[PDB]
Symmetry: D3
Amino acid sequence: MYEAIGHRVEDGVAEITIKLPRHRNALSVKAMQEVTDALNRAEEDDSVGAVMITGAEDAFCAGFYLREIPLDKGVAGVRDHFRIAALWWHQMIHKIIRVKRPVLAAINGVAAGGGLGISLASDMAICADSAKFVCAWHTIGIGNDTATSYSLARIVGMRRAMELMLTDRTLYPEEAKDWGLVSRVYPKDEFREVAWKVARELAAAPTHLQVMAKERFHAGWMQPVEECTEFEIQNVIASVTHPHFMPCLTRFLDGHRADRPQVELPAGV
Amino acid sequence: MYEAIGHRVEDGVAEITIKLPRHRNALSVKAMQEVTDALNRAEEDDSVGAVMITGAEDAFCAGFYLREIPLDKGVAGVRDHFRIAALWWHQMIHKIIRVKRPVLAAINGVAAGGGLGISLASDMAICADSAKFVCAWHTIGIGNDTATSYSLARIVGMRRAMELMLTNRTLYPEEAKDWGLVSRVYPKDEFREVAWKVARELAAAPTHLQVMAKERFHAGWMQPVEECTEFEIQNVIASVTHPHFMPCLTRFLDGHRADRPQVELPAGV
Amino acid sequence: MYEAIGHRVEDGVAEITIKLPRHRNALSVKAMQEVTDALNRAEEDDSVGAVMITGAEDAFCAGFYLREIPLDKGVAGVRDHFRIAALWWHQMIHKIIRVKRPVLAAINGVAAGGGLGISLASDMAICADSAKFVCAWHTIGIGNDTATSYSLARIVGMRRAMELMLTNRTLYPEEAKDWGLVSRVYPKDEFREVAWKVARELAAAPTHLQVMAKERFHAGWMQPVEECTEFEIQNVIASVTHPHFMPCLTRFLDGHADRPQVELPAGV
Amino acid sequence: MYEAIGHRVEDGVAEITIKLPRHRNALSVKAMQEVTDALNRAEEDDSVGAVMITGAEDAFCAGFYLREIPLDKGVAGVRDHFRIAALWWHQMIHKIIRVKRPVLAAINGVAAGGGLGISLASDMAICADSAKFVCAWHTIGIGNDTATSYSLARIVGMRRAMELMLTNRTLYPEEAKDWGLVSRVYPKDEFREVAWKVARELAAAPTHLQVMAKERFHAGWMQPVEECTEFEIQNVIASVTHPHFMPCLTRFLDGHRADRPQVELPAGV
Amino acid sequence: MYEAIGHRVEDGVAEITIKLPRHRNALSVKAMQEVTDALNRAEEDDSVGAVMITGAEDAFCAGFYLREIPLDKGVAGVRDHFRIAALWWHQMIHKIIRVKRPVLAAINGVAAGGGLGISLASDMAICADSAKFVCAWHTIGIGNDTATSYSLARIVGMRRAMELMLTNRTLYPEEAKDWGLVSRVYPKDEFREVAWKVARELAAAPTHLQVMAKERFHAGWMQPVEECTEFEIQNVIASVTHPHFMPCLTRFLDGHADRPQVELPAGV
Amino acid sequence: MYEAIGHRVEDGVAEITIKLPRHRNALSVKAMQEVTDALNRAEEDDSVGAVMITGAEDAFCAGFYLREIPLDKGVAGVRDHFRIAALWWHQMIHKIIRVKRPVLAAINGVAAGGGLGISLASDMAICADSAKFVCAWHTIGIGNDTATSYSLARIVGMRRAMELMLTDRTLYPEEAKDWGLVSRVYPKDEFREVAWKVARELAAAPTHLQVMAKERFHAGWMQPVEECTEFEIQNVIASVTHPHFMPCLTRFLDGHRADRPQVELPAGV
Ligand SMILES: [Ca+2]
Ligand SMILES: [Ca+2]
Ligand SMILES: [Ca+2]
Ligand SMILES: [Ca+2]
Ligand SMILES: [Ca+2]
Ligand SMILES: [Ca+2]
């Protein structure tokens, strides 16, 4: 089906692969449209319980596909293009945050500009020890976007966000982990496999509860406590009404205990 | 007086103990009502300078009291119980956050679900080396609440908040501290004493200024700088008019440094 | 010339020096007013690309100049002083956050009360290994201000913000860095020079782009994603329309983006 | 079933009647709890399409039930009663606003204090020509509540809201209508019938779309346009997937105009 | 040239005409896209000082072009169409509110669903005595959109907004004016001309100042007073620094401010 | 005392008179400072129960004092001036909205630019039949300020606000009243007297309750209902604790009834 990205649905995971390895996996306008499409479809698929965004080969995503920028048609040309890709970049970004599925960013290589935006917009993020993160905007002479003014500070605090953007420094895995930018780091050679198992475990876990958590996290950052608890309680009520409930309860009371977390992230490095 | 909680007021500290050790200090509907009452009372007691919440024995609070959920009244019976419990759990959580007293969560053991919510709603938190934290909602099949959509990310950032909720893994003291969930960790055997001493200091410190700081912190998170300052200024003017001020100014002019601590947190482990 | 602060403009950097060394660089009402003026001027100056705030000597800023407080006019005299002082302090704190230039806080030493406030309001912050931070408000007996109810938790999260204020604990460099309060720590001896290098770089960096990011960061903290992106897009369009654009592109294209704009030495 | 309110469900309408005529329909703590319960029940009744709140006889609701305030227990007794009553008054007010059903306030007489709060929290309001509205808080010496700080200005603008609260004057039907406080006024003798008919229409109209509109209105007041649209879009997509849609599209394509009313409000006086 | 809409640029006014008269000026996906483009262009054109949105003939805009809905692809086909359509409709609604030009909505006739949305999103609105407004959403069976959850209550208050949507009542000009939905009402016959005059004036009015006000109004609705004033101040400074300033001053000073910028005939 | 404005405290009212009649009462930088001062003092004066802002003679306030603008010193000069007056204009505006006293704007003549800002910032507004309102900004070539982007729409709705600013039209009393911009209009010859009596009645009414209402109105416009009710309840509790309370209650129960509103605004014209 898709012609600009890799995609598959297997074992409950809708896996989207950014695919333009020769150009570091930068995202073309058509690919972005496909990514948005695939997210829409994932959310509409009862068989899908989670989404995985990863890059082909050794790069995650190098951001804007600079080579699509028309040089043959003046300022207007350049602008008209940006308007177009900007639209798509954002439709895509918003979707990752709004989609009714947990989204895992398996950062397998470099993430720059929009690629970093992607990793920040996702719900969970893990990376290879060979990965790296860089804003890149300030270097190419373009204003920051891809929701970086939303997501970054929400994850690393205002100061670190500011620093990264202003210095255009490259953030390595250890530091990214420390920052909370990634949860775990895994050896390059084992990454794919690790990431694929995490994805499947996220898919297998109860989507309903996951979505409740995800939407409340985004909403609650900006709301007062009493407003947060009202939407939280609505979820509670809905959740105890759902068929998934009683069985969990009975199992607890019966003496069953889980020998492992819902989603296991191995220690990594 | 209270029949489902432990309570005592000494040395300027109103100490609330979650008490149902046989059931890991899970919080009953009756108990939650008593905690709120106790919180209201503390705020009205001139002799109380701080509140401390802790658990009996070796557990902090196991969250929802699952054993009081009706099982012989259908989904309706279930739904009904949760509506009630939910009202009281949130009236309590909100009270911890709005109470005109600094609240120290002395986490002496496991804190799960609503127990973790309590920990996160408090103003300060310290724990024993044997304590542990877990979301647990998902495992039991319930949507998350107890203000986790408000408090968690405000403390650990959105990424870590999402992670903990989604994986449902157990967070241990060292990591909790690293995340900002607890300020310090103490050996189990020294914990109680250490905590009482911290509570006393908090109690002895200037309540009026504490309340100003507490309210401003909650409010300011969501306000633009110019509005925050207006409210801060109103507090400044009120504080320099309060009788507490002059004498401090005097001491300072007389060589006593303002870097003197109000509360001494021992290093711990 | 200013009378209450130090002020240098070099290599596109307008350096503001808090200067009242005998009294730990506490900020007097006059000084505050000059800081704000210096801010406005910097932004007005096409030559200036960055602003650096630092203290004279070995101290950053001890906060409110308590020795300015009138004691011969009763409570009302106290109150009146604080009203004027509060006005100026906040006009200045606001400026730092709103000014159309990147602001580097070079914390050469102790930062207390309003001095910490200054530290938190700045866009970037680095300190000398001999620096320290303390709230002070709770001991001096004054309600917290200088936008601490805005900036502290934004930088260190709610729990740490609350702790710091309530305990009146002093924060040393290692912890400050860990907390995100400062990006790097440097040896007292190498400090000023490191700081100047950084500042120079920031200055050279593309100002327009820096402002976009700055403004966006402050605004976005409180906005839903779809509103954030509308503002980011506007910036994007404006930027690709600006002269600075093509050459960067062309260059990238040509062979010449992961290149650091501002090098921040690892320090200690 | 209920002992302090009148209640009935007919023709798709759950009708809640504030009933304490001898005391001008002031709302007792017991009564308020019943109203909330009734609201919860309506939202869960497939056969209820709308809720109508009105008063017995010739008064709508005189607000706080002043005669149940303890007088032989000091300020404490007073304070205690108000904390309780306050919890229940707000649980009810919030429920009117959050309930997943359109709520019509059929103001058949005076609405004072909390009575006016009820009127303002409802989704739609109409009144008899003999109705009247008054803040009353100040006269009785109490700070205003019942969400007047939320609802009043959202309906009449800040100036008129301030004015009414500060002057404490009685607003009559014509002015109320002019202010937007009521949509229409009807002769006392025709009121009840007119209101039941309006309620039935509201009940018969598409609840799902009503709820979408209601929630969006409350939320959107405080949200920027791009966020509002995202949520509106999610509703659009859900509504065109709902079975209700196709048949309407069909009718329209078959010449039936979308200007057909869902609810017919008679001119009144 | 556009293919789905009418588009005139005269006397600094870029006039956008919704044009699908056979179908009551419903907006097709193509058309939407052109409206947005026309918006961008207007803002890009130093010659254009205002934008006017109106409908062809006797109708303003009947909303969603329901005849574009695919019926041969099942539910999914429906859904897919609406996803694309929703995208375009909102990109356009947003533009109207965000565009850096004043936007006048000249409601020459019926405005339903998205057409009302358009009406609400515009900066100013006037209608012909033959116009009318109706939500339509609740009868057509579609959840409300086109920013109605944003703009309606902002204009008419929560109670009236809710009523209108829930009853699906049609609003005639007298009421619309009373409600604040339109500023003036004019005879069908004099309409277009009145509208053009107004538009021309808006166009001539100082654009920079108009944008400042527009942006501020949208932003301020949700901000505390001290943040509002910071943004208003910035605008003030920018404006007194702009060429346009002095002459106005000088003039005032000289003898030549209560003079109407845009005359709005009393109409009926 | 003051040298640039008229001022007096009498019968519980702190009356501030803008005084520069030759220049239509435009506000000079020094006067603005005095106004702010007088507001500060009013709030600190136990004898003051309300504030009245009015203009001298036949003009209310013509706004910025254009004649203070330096022409002898280039762009910089003009800018430096604006920076200064802007600061004061806003300190003043904010104060009217934040001051712990009800503020009545007795608009006795023309209100332009900042003068209109003043009338919008006040808590209650009434005018003479000879008064008029005009933005004026767009005409003098200056961006709108004085909190017009806060206050106007809050009072008249977004459309009317936009219109007024964009057209720079002059709004007459009848229309201003209709808009909710003023509550009442009185004949020029009786205005002063009417306004003076309203002021005294606002002063005589319970300041504590007035402030509660005022602050909650400004805050609540932007807050969700559950957050609004929490601050509302805090006021309730405080109010029933206050000595003013019991007496009101007892009087009610005893059979006393007020023969008039707290603050009587006569019908006017
Ligand atoms: Ca899943
Ligand atoms: Ca204390
Ligand atoms: Ca620069
Ligand atoms: Ca219905
Ligand atoms: Ca123009
Ligand atoms: Ca008073």
